């Protein structure tokens, strides 16, 4: 049973096992309750099949005979739709369990006690520093006092913006199976675990596994943004939420650990959750001026009522008698005016005596939270409500003021002591998560602003915006900056993307501006882009405009933005609107699409150095937003030494950093990793700020300098100048299949990294390292030595290389080999070859520099986890291969088995989404 | 700081330490924190005059020397009233912990592998059979098929009938503050426990404590009989409402491992609870119609609402979209009569999709459970309600329906796993609790009821019921129980008493029959007592008439109980009436202070025996109520005992006991122990009537025949006909004082036992014991061997010396003897003292008999709980014996100490009420 699937598995990852290392024992305990799952639902035909997918994938991933592949790709073209679907299903679902089994894992793993000190520490979740460690290497390394430690603290903030997942929002309801799943499977491993406690657990386990698997609905609509934004949003509920008070306390106790005898003020705002759904419609029509409105609605509907949700808790402990005057006198108001008769409460349904003060404070902030939700729904289903003002909460300050006097009454009657419990808990939410949890970034392009500029200009009689150099648009937007008069008159007339974009405004201008973040500008190049949106949210009257933040994404755009930066700071108007502050983001994905990563990420190092010193140099205050695709969005231990790499002074107490939708399972899904995440953002941030990584040397930047031209040259001559790339890309990716569910140019960067992550191929994570490592060595001997003492030394580099070779190791160059001869006309084959060629010879130098023999021997317990998914993984990968082939191809058939599953018209596309959801699951994040 | 508290402690308890053994530890934990936390709340002094208190008591329980006794006293008789109050407090906070402490030995003390089969193994929680062991005993020892034993369980029921905690009902904010210091302390304990997750919890557990401390004001008034009734509900919500789900699961687990391969069905009603707060008016004219009302109306508003507040985390669940035909209907129906717009929910606030059919199902079951709810909770606030019947359940089968619906079309669809979660347990919860989680029982005494048909008789002209015979009664209670018009016209003249009873039908008549179950006559005699109520009920035309139980009290009474059943049961209107069942009840400690405690247990004992046999005879199915005050209202192991104990056949698959509310807390407050309680009770119900045990030797009934006479002559002749024990009990005892907030014959049973037990006397429990064994002896030296034999090998016998056993474990005559000291006039302290003299010679025959030369040498971890709070509670004894003297003398005066606590008009009465508390929370049950 159990023993012959733990056998399987561990062939598959030879390796040195402790008692704390079950992850291979977690996969076959879970597969095994699985296989007998899908034995009763489907039959045991079923069953074998899909162990029999199982067994030649664990076969081909154990020494790569092309043979086995070919077999299962047999087997699986042989199934019929029916079929097909359950067995696409199936292996996703142990995808699912795979990375929970993973997550429980890293958890438990035990804790290095004696870290060696060298900043690759801080690479591993097992290794790195947690706050008190850090507290200590800045008191005892870098001379900080304490003092010094804990202002610091104070003043800095981490700010974390989620992102869509881009394939596969999961609905809250399976996240609440998956996460009984991961308990269940850990309380199995309970030391001292009953008999019979044990046979209950294992039925329960069987029952989640079944629960999870049976929640499958394939629904014809794509989910609403509404939808994707409220699923979204369920890791608040399931860990967030609990887990910022829980971080928070522990950096209390480290504090008190170093001599600091005071807790973290409650309202120091040192992490704040922001979000882009809803708020990106950069080249996405379904993101209107509606949606925006709903998404900020729901926001402030689900913070309202996740306090309310949990003060009836507060009320009961808060029992106590002894209070102070103010609030004796504040309760005998509220006691006064209060109603003789029923609420329609679970908790305190009678009225309120005045012998319970607390209770009679926090009763009434629970009436207006539960005002300020029903409000927002009346909005959002009926488009108003009759609820008044002084009925709700409209700004924060408004809801902390009675918890702060509940926490004074208790300090001044002798109870400090119980104030700092669930009181301080809930002072630390509100102070975190305000009235609405995230605050949501507006984004679109700066040609959409163009655009509507354009359409005022001409209806005005003046004149042509975009026909306007660069110079006069300057001029034209200072001067209607201070105008006397408005812009836009009621003929203005309106296309329907001009309409869409000026509505967005209105919206802005009519929603509470604690709802808003930044308005990002993408594919911005220039001053006049930034003063465009100024000019647009002044026209509209925003009483609290949003900071304007360009998003230089092309290299060529890159190295403008130094200039555009420096004139908007050399501007009166703007320097007084910006107050000392301003936020730029980059995007990793965006560069390096434009001109292949390895030379994105040096120009990203050096943009940043850059526009550091511009600030500087003007006074203004600098946030780098961190965008999708670097270093920084790994997750787990990598960010952390991901973090402390940045270049001297690009954090300087402010964090701004995207969690990709592909990450957030991982780092906030499980409660101890949700924790872990807090922590290590906060801890690098701090440190970052006193203990800069070391500047790199002259020789360094000038090979750097050199190979990336050659980098690029590469990339480009491969991606934008070979005139069969497009034509080679459509057929050997799923990206045609993707994009209906200008080139490569004009697709966007999440499509590009998506469609060659599914063929496990990865061109756009490695594509130009190999030109550039080559060149350097043939050009020098030497430099091969240089390279591996930048990878030894130098922080940059060495995460650099770290998430390419992590993407290496999740890629496998057989299954885009099947895909070229399934997929691909005969004469583009040697163009897929060569690539192959290159990807080898790339991964072959890489390791080199890195001085490994093979892929990932820094990181066993990563590679463990890689090697564990990718069966699963690679049966996908061949569903999905026929499946193109059957969807592109209708007069390619094969014989058919007779239908395998039993029960007790869905079709290839369905089938095709199944894998395309499974193989990105399993594969996480790339680049 | 830790280690000498230990130190200290441990010195008090001698015992042989393994790993499990952890009691010490977890008091000295707990007792220093709190010392800390009175320091910083009441200052240095405070803490030290605590502790000075506490050594002393401990040195006092050490060597027993008087002299420790008189510094104690000194000590606590120079304290203010301020400071008297504080150390009153502290002392009884210190007992309720060191309670939650033993609360948590009890749970993880390690079973007993191999059990030596002894009955006596079913005495200790350790050793005794779970129910699996008791499912092999009766298949493998008794023969029994598997399919026997489910069958009998099947049609097995228990019913636990709570009680009001004599003194202190524990309010449900202050429960939940307990509950969560003996979490924090087992978390303190957690194997691999982080330093820092450590220093947490320690600070939690130093908060929980104070909190707890801090929950302390001092309310004017008694507790009204509904608030009473709402804290007594309170372990429902803590431990009962997931317990009942969690054993009926272990019971489909021992089923399956049997051989039985079903659950036990759903709705078999295994346990049901009822409840005597707000129900039983015996003695208690607090307790009127409007009251009884109110605690039906209160128990169907909590039932309901706790179905409410657990319906929204089985919709999300139950996020399935397959569904069978008569589901998926009946989801259609209600998805076209579905309201457009906002639920004020916390969950599913929007309309729900068809494609949900489950949460279809589910939400409309959500909207009935809350209007139920809103109903009751307008009936009490506003007198009535708009809220029509079929917006709201009127019957458990219309909330079973749709759940079983919802279970079905699990089934069908293949998800049958799935069904046997929580659905499983949600079922069974409704079918244990119903829409009134407990059955309310009314009592009343039979006097009460004579006099209304006294009333009756004499306005109607007829005579005086009161004056007729016995006879007379009969004849004409019969022919007006067919008589064709109503007794009862619109100008009978009524006193108070009687329309108090009156009324109190009416309210039977006018509530659903759901809510009641029997009506209990107290101080029963005869047959017309019973058709008296028979009657009424009748005359008040109630639909479903309560079951009539008397209960027979005296020992005359229990003699006369057997002719009056036979003539119930001969009687054709009666037996009609009945349907083949009857119950009645015993009341123990009744019995025993009518004759003593050794007399009345041998007189139940023969009086059940007897009136089974009668019951047999005439076709009537027989349960007999225990009442408080033996062996079977123990709780903890003994509880398992007493119940195989039983006479033969007096269970026969129904159980009814009373559940004291000062067992409550042991029995049901740590989920565990709430565990094990269900067990035990469902356990020995079942086995008891496939193996009743030994019945008793000729020579040992008439052994105990002839030791009854002499007992009660020794109990009666103390206590009734000693012209000054009266006046000697109102002196060494808080009696009167204890009933102001015809002799000892109409003192309740409750006040006579609380009094002595309060003075660690505890009188009502052993006296006549000791002229029982010392005549039987020295009649014949033979009979202490025959005694010995007995206590080995009988089960009744056992039990009943081992209950006596433990109270004097709990007693200390040194208190009783610094009371007369104090207390009583210098001319009764012989007779104070020769009672000591029987106490000591009555505990010495006891010890010989039992074949200890120590108290429970027998039951070492109950000496242990007992001895680790002997400290406390004697500080308590010392300072109430002071309060007394101060109350009862406005001369008695010492000096004073200057003033020692601080902070930052409570009298002795106060501090009175606070040492009562205490002592008995300490003492728990005894007679």
Same mark, same amino acid.
Request: with cysteine; net charge negative; glycine share 6%.
């Given at each position: 049973?159990?023993?012959?699937?733990?056998?399987?598995?561990?062939?598959?990852?030879?390796?040195?096992?402790?008692?704390?290392?079950?992850?291979?024992?977690?996969?076959?305990?879970?597969?095994?309750?699985?296989?007998?799952?899908?034995?009763?639902?489907?039959?045991?035909?079923?069953?074998?099949?899909? &162990?029999?997918?199982?067994?030649?994938?664990?076969?081909?991933?154990?020494?790569?005979?092309?043979?086995?592949?070919?077999?299962?790709?047999?087997?699986?073209?042989?199934?019929?739709?029916?079929?097909?679907?359950?067995?696409?299903?199936?292996?996703?679902?142990?995808?699912?369990?795979?990375?929970?089994?993973?997550?429980?894992?890293?958890?438990?793993?035990?804790?290095?006690?004696?870290? *060696?000190?060298?900043?690759?520490?801080?690479?591993?979740?097992?290794?790195?520093?947690?706050?008190?460690?850090?507290?200590?290497?800045?008191?005892?390394?870098?001379?900080?006092?304490?003092?010094?430690?804990?202002?610091?603290?104070?003043?800095?903030?981490?700010?974390?913006?989620?992102?869509?997942?881009?394939?596969?929002?999961?609905?809250? *309801?399976?996240?609440?199976?998956?996460?009984?799943?991961?308990?269940?499977?850990?309380?199995?491993?309970?030391?001292?675990? +009953?008999?019979?406690?044990?046979?209950?657990?294992?039925?329960?386990?069987?029952?989640?596994?079944?629960?999870?698997?049976?929640?499958?609905?394939?629904?014809?609509?794509?989910?609403?943004?509404?939808?994707?934004?409220?699923?979204?949003?369920?890791?608040?509920?399931?860990?967030?939420?609990?887990?910022?008070?829980?971080?928070?306390?522990?950096?209390?106790?480290?504090?008190?650990?170093?001599?600091?005898?005071?807790?973290?003020?409650?309202?120091?705002?040192?992490?704040?959750?922001? %979000?882009?759904?809803?708020?990106?419609?950069?080249?996405?029509?379904?993101?209107?001026?509606?949606?925006?409105?709903?998404?900020?609605?729901?926001?402030?509907?689900?913070?309202?009522?996740?306090?309310?949700?949990?003060?009836?808790?507060?009320?009961?402990?808060?029992?106590?008698?002894?209070?102070?005057?103010?609030?004796?006198?504040?309760?005998?108001?509220?006691?006064?005016?209060? #109603?003789?008769?029923?609420?329609?409460?679970?908790?305190?349904?009678?009225?309120?005596?005045?012998?319970?003060?607390?209770?009679?404070?926090?009763?009434?902030?629970?009436?207006?939270?539960?005002?300020?939700?029903?409000?927002?729904?009346?909005?959002?289903?009926?488009?108003?409500?009759?609820?008044?003002?002084?009925?709700?909460?409209?700004?924060?300050?408004?809801?902390?003021?009675?918890?702060?006097?509940?926490? #004074?009454?208790?300090?001044?009657?002798?109870?400090?002591?119980?104030?700092?419990? *669930?009181?301080?808990?809930?002072?630390?939410?509100?102070?975190?998560?305000?009235?609405?949890?995230?605050?949501?970034?507006?984004?679109?392009?700066?040609?959409?602003?163009?655009?509507?500029?354009?359409?005022?200009? /001409?209806?005005?009689?003046?004149?042509?915006?975009?026909?306007?150099?660069?110079?006069?648009? &300057?001029?034209?937007?200072?001067?209607?900056? %201070? @105008?006397?008069?408005?812009?836009?008159?009621?003929?203005?007339?309106?296309?329907?993307?001009?309409?869409?974009?000026?509505?967005?405004?209105?919206?802005?201008?009519?929603?509470?501006?604690?709802?808003?973040?930044?308005?990002?500008?993408?594919?911005?190049?220039?001053?006049?882009?930034?003063?465009?949106?100024?000019?647009?949210?002044?026209?509209?009257?925003?009483?609290?405009?949003?900071?304007?933040?360009?998003?230089?994404?092309?290299?060529?755009?890159?190295?403008?933005?130094?200039?555009?930066?420096?004139?908007?700071?050399?501007?009166?108007?703007?320097?007084?609107?910006?107050?000392?502050?301003?936020?730029?983001?980059?995007?990793?994905?965006?560069?390096?699409?434009?001109?292949?990563?390895?030379?994105?990420?040096? &120009?990203?190092?050096?943009?940043?150095?850059?526009?550091?010193?511009?600030?500087?140099?003007?006074?203004?205050?600098?946030?780098?937003?961190?965008?999708?695709?670097?270093?920084?969005?790994?997750?787990?231990?990598?960010?952390?030494?991901?973090?402390?790499?940045?270049?001297?002074?690009?954090?300087?107490?402010?964090?701004?950093? +995207?969690?990709?939708?592909?990450?957030?399972? /991982?780092?906030?899904?499980?409660?101890?990793?949700?924790?872990?995440?807090?922590?290590?953002?906060?801890?690098?941030?701090?440190?970052?700020?006193?203990?800069?990584?070391?500047?790199?040397?002259?020789?360094?930047?000038?090979?750097?300098?050199?190979?990336?031209?050659?980098?690029?040259?590469?990339?480009?001559?491969?991606?934008?100048?070979?005139?069969?790339?497009?034509?080679?890309?459509?057929?050997?990716?799923?990206?045609?299949?993707?994009?209906?569910?200008?080139?490569?140019?004009?697709?966007?960067?999440?499509?590009?990294?998506? *469609?060659?992550?599914?063929?496990?191929?990865?061109?756009?994570?490695?594509? @130009?390292?190999?030109?550039?490592?080559?060149?350097?060595?043939?050009?020098?001997?030497?430099?091969? &030595?240089?390279?591996?003492?930048?990878?030894?030394?130098?922080?940059?580099?060495?995460?650099?290389?770290?998430?390419?070779?992590?993407?290496?190791?999740?890629?496998?160059?057989?299954?885009?080999?099947?895909?070229?001869?399934?997929?691909?006309?005969?004469?583009?084959?040697?163009?897929?070859?060569?690539?192959?060629?290159?990807?080898?010879?790339?991964?072959?130098?890489?390791?080199?520099?890195?001085?490994?023999?093979?892929?990932?021997?820094?990181?066993?317990?990563?590679?463990?986890?890689?090697?564990?998914?990718?069966?699963?993984?690679? +049966?996908?990968?061949?569903?999905?291969?026929?499946?193109?082939?059957?969807?592109?191809?209708?007069?390619?058939?094969?014989?058919?088995?007779?239908?395998?599953?039993?029960?007790?018209?869905?079709?290839?596309?369905?089938?095709?989404?199944?894998?395309?959801?499974?193989?990105?699951?399993?594969?996480?994040?790339?680049?």
């Amino acid at each position: 049973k159990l023993a012959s699937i733990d056998a399987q598995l561990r062939l598959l990852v030879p390796g040195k096992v402790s008692e704390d290392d079950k992850l291979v024992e977690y996969d076959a305990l879970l597969l095994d309750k699985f296989l007998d799952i899908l034995q009763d639902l489907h039959g045991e035909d079923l069953k074998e099949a899909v &162990q029999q997918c199982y067994e030649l994938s664990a076969e081909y991933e154990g020494k790569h005979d092309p043979k086995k592949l070919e077999e299962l790709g047999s087997l699986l073209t042989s199934l019929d739709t029916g079929d097909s679907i359950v067995i696409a299903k199936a292996f996703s679902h142990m995808l699912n369990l795979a990375n929970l089994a993973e997550e429980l894992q890293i958890a438990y793993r035990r804790r290095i006690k004696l870290k *060696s000190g060298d900043f690759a520490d801080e690479a591993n979740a097992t290794t790195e520093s947690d706050i008190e460690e850090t507290f200590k290497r800045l008191v005892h390394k870098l001379n900080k006092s304490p003092e010094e430690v804990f202002d610091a603290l104070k003043n800095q903030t981490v700010e974390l913006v989620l992102t869509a997942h881009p394939t596969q929002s999961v609905r809250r *309801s399976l996240l609440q199976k998956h996460g009984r799943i991961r308990n269940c499977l850990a309380q199995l491993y309970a030391k001292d675990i +009953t008999p019979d406690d044990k046979q209950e657990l294992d039925e329960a386990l069987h029952r989640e596994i079944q629960a999870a698997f049976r929640t499958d609905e394939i629904r014809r609509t794509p989910p609403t943004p509404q939808d994707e934004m409220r699923a979204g949003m369920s890791y608040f509920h399931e860990t967030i939420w609990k887990g910022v008070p829980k971080f928070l306390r522990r950096v209390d106790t480290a504090l008190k650990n170093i001599g600091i005898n005071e807790r973290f003020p409650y309202n120091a705002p040192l992490i704040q959750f922001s %979000s882009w759904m809803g708020g990106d419609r950069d080249g996405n029509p379904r993101v209107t001026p509606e949606v925006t409105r709903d998404v900020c609605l729901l926001a402030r509907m689900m913070t309202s009522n996740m306090y309310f949700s949990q003060i009836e808790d507060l009320m009961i402990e808060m029992s106590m008698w002894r209070c102070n005057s103010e609030l004796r006198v504040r309760a005998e108001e509220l006691y006064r005016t209060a #109603r003789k008769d029923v609420k329609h409460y679970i908790e305190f349904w009678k009225r309120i005596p005045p012998n319970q003060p607390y209770r009679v404070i926090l009763g009434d902030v629970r009436d207006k939270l539960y005002n300020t939700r029903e409000r927002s729904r009346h909005l959002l289903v009926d488009g108003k409500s009759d609820i008044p003002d002084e009925a709700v909460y409209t700004n924060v300050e408004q809801l902390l003021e009675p918890l702060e006097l509940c926490y #004074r009454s208790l300090c001044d009657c002798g109870d400090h002591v119980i104030a700092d419990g *669930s009181l301080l808990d809930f002072l630390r939410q509100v102070s975190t998560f305000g009235l609405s949890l995230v605050k949501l970034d507006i984004r679109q392009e700066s040609d959409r602003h163009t655009e509507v500029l354009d359409a005022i200009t /001409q209806h005005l009689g003046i004149g042509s915006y975009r026909e306007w150099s660069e110079e006069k648009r &300057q001029e034209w937007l200072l001067a209607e900056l %201070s @105008g006397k008069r408005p812009l836009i008159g009621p003929d203005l007339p309106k296309t329907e993307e001009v309409k869409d974009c000026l509505d967005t405004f209105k919206v802005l201008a009519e929603l509470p501006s604690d709802c808003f973040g930044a308005y990002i500008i993408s594919m911005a190049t220039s001053t006049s882009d930034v003063l465009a949106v100024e000019l647009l949210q002044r026209e509209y009257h925003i009483k609290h405009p949003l900071r304007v933040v360009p998003l230089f994404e092309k290299l060529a755009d890159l190295e403008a933005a130094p200039a555009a930066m420096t004139r908007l700071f050399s501007m009166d108007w703007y320097r007084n609107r910006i107050d000392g502050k301003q936020e730029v983001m980059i995007g990793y994905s965006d560069s390096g699409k434009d001109a292949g990563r390895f030379s994105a990420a040096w &120009q990203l190092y050096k943009t940043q150095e850059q526009i550091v010193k511009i600030a500087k140099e003007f006074g203004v205050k600098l946030v780098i937003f961190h965008g999708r695709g670097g270093t920084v969005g790994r997750g787990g231990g990598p960010t952390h030494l991901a973090l402390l790499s940045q270049p001297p002074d690009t954090i300087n107490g402010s964090l701004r950093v +995207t969690v990709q939708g592909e990450v957030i399972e /991982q780092s906030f899904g499980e409660e101890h990793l949700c924790f872990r995440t807090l922590q290590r953002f906060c801890a690098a941030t701090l440190e970052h700020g006193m203990n800069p990584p070391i500047s790199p040397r002259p020789e360094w930047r000038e090979l750097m300098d050199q190979m990336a031209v050659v980098a690029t040259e590469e990339y480009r001559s491969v991606v934008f100048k070979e005139p069969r790339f497009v034509e080679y890309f459509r057929l050997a990716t799923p990206e045609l299949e993707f994009g209906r569910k200008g080139g490569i140019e004009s697709l966007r960067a999440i499509p590009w990294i998506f *469609s060659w992550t599914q063929t496990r191929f990865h061109l756009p994570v490695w594509l @130009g390292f190999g030109a550039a490592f080559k060149h350097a060595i043939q050009k020098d001997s030497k430099n091969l &030595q240089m390279l591996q003492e930048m990878y030894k030394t130098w922080p940059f580099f060495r995460v650099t290389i770290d998430l390419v070779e992590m993407v290496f190791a999740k890629g496998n160059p057989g299954i885009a080999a099947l895909n070229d001869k399934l997929l691909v006309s005969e004469d583009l084959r040697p163009f897929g070859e060569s690539l192959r060629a290159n990807y080898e010879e790339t991964k072959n130098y890489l390791l080199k520099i890195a001085g490994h023999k093979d892929l990932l021997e820094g990181d066993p317990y990563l590679k463990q986890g890689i090697r564990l998914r990718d069966p699963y993984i690679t +049966t996908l990968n061949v569903c999905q291969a026929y499946t193109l082939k059957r969807i592109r191809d209708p007069n390619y058939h094969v014989t058919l088995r007779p239908h395998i599953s039993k029960e007790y018209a869905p079709g290839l596309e369905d089938t095709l989404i199944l894998t395309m959801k499974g193989i990105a699951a399993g594969m996480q994040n790339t680049g």
